[PDB]
Amino acid sequence: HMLHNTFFICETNQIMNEIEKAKGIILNRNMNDIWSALLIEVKKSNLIIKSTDRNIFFESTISIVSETDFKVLINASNFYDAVKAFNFYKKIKIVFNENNSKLEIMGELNDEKEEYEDHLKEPTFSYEEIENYNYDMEDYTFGIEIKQKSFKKVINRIAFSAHLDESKNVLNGVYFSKDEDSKLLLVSTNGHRMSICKTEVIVEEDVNFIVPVKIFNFLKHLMSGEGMVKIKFSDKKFYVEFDNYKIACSLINGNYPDYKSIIPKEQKNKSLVSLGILKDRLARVNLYVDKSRKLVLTFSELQLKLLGEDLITGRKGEFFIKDPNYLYDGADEVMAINISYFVEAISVFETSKIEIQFNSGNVLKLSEPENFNFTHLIMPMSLG
Amino acid sequence: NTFFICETNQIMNEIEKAKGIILNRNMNDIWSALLIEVKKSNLIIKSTDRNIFFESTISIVSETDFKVLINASNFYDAVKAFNFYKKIKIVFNENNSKLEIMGEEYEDHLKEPTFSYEEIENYNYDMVNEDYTFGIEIKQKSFKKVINRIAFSAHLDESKNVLNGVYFSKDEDSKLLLVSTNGHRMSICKTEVIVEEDVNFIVPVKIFNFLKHLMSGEGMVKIKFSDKKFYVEFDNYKIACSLINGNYPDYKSIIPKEQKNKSLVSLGILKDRLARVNLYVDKSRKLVLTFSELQLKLLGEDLITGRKGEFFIKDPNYLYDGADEVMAINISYFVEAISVFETSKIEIQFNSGNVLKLSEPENFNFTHLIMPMSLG
Amino acid sequence: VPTLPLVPXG
Amino acid sequence: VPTLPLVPXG
């Protein structure tokens, strides 16, 4: 590889955005760590950017100008800093100096370079380290293509409910299944709160897959919301492709719990609450809830009472929501609920009002009026 | 009958300001509290860190006088919680040692525990003081600018008493002058205020960091000094603290007389390039500058790894009259200093190997000095 | 803090 | 990291 012909020219803002995206899954330990690096490949007039956390494998492509093909492994954080450092150039020229294990970066100006021009030198890994990192983008058992906008909404309603500990293997995954009508269905839970999203997609094949939630948190940052996204499953892997991206990860090989059994059939007590006012009041009563997150709710016909109380000190805040912001049909019911779960759940709702229904001493069910595709359940806390 | 009515947004803002000096994190510690007192139709809010003493007043409606010592963070949260009420009623129940808040059955209601009345004497401070020997007045806008130019240069370690202070002095023309330094960089800011009396006082910087958040920018500020105390009053605020008893260093002796090398640099471009080259400067903060007739070079280099960033500033953004000079400087000091400049261009002048002087063209009140770092 | 009626799990 | 020419201090 020679300096004069081992380079590429790219749009600075574009490669900045793609590096920011790719490094999203990279835990940036130390500049000498190959797992803190990303792999860029020049292939004719395309640049391929790859990153991995050794479970999720990510690949993006952008158009460039080049003369020879080559690969470079470079610390993601430093490379991002370099491109940010040069964001005042519309285009940059990136030169690979294999003799010194360095990327030399200069603005790709439109005409002559002077003696003294701005210049960056970014050290790279050796060519022998690329073999340790590289991944090449299996027999698919089932695939669907859906609108990006819909998939983003489903992710927004599903991802937050999965268990947050990646070592609690099953509950940290998003469960893909099929309902009685053969419609694709997503479920997530941490054991205490749960999201269920039924789609309109009909799938003839068997669907029984558990996908670690991290890829969905990643995806919601990547998807524009315009266009289509192809999703594919194999025996061991999950695959997603859309726009200039390809992403894959491993499935969790386990048995997802029988979520169907905890869905309440008919609930005796039903409330309809104005969403914006609920959000505002929860933010205020939150100032009176301790680290246990225990919020005490009282449902009556005329009002919903929100009580934040500290039993040790006597510090207490009480807020009421009444007509025209609250309707209730049921018995007088007092219950404790995790305010973080409550707030997190209602923050994904987009309707003017929210339905909150429950059987006494049982799971609280949250839903949108006229939406029969989305259900969120929250187990109450012991009142005492 | 122990209650008052106030404007919610007003008391929220005044509590937020008052608790700025309250850093304790146990709710059971009186030094985490602030002290409110209802006196006729005024609410007086007092807070202290046991060095700075702060007092503010706002108009209220009440019928009885009382005082309450209450954890500042909880009280702020309570008033924030009720920000959707234009006015609130605050009721003090000594029978429960509780402050109760309501909008002015089944209504929103807050209960805030308070300290015992027996603790109030431990906290209370009276600002009435005739020990002050002389006072001066300065416009808020002017004082805010001076503070902005002086505070960041004081030494950050409060145990280093003198260098952590702002030095009040007077130049040969009898104008009040402020000085601050940490030993490596120094601000010297002359005011427009003419002062007849002798001025030789060292005030801990913390009160000035506090003050810049408090001053609206309209109106006058009264400053008073005594042998032992410093006092400011403006708008509805009174603040006091202790002076540092010591001898401030002879700052006049280090002011450079004539400097051989003078440069004039566009400020916006300098700030922008410093933020970029900062991504190539390590924990030592060592930025290498090369001044030449045609350009200024900014070099961030890590010699171990070879990671390097080089930026140039050239005509018409840079003018230079001097010899070729390469020097090292703490990039954090440099950025901090130029962030307070408000002119289009900045003057950077120096004698080879000596202190760098930063100033605004045609402005002679403000001087900033930065000692270079050793090049090797 | 009881869990949802999940089998197994709670 | 030389100090300013302060007397006393450096």
Structural class designation of chain A: alpha+beta
Query: Helix segment count of chain C?
Result: 0
Strand order of the largest sheet of chain A: 14-11-12-13-26-25-24-18-22
Strand content of chain A: 35-45%
Radius of gyration of chain A: 26 Å
Q: Write down how many β-strands of chain A occur, each being a DSSP E stretch of 2 or more residues.
A: 26
Strand count, sense and barrel status of the largest sheet of chain A are: 9 strands, antiparallel
In whole angstroms, how far apart are the ends of chain C?
10 Å
Identify the biggest protein-protein contact and residues per side.
A-B, 34 and 34 residues
- The helix fraction of chain C, in percent, is under 10%
Principal-axis shape of chain A? elongated
Count of β-strands of chain C: 0
Oligomer: heterotetramer
Strand content of chain C: under 5%
What global shape of chain C is seen?
elongated
What is the count of DSSP helices of chain A, taking H or I runs of 4+ residues? 7
Protein name (chain A): Beta sliding clamp
Pfam families (chain A): DNA_pol3_beta, DNA_pol3_beta_2, DNA_pol3_beta_3
Keywords (chain A): Cytoplasm, DNA replication, DNA-binding, DNA-directed DNA polymerase, Nucleotidyltransferase, Transferase
Subcellular location (chain A): Cytoplasm
How would you briefly describe this protein structure?
The complex is a heterotetramer, with 2 copies of chain A and 2 copies of chain C (10 residues). By secondary structure, chain A is α+β, with helices and mostly antiparallel strands. Chain A is 17% helix and 40% strand.
List keywords for this structure.
heterotetramer; A: 384 residues; alpha+beta; nine-stranded antiparallel sheet; eight-stranded antiparallel sheet; 7 helices; 40% strand; elongated; C: 10 residues; little secondary structure; 3'-5' exonuclease activity (chain B); transferase (chain B); Beta sliding clamp (chain B)
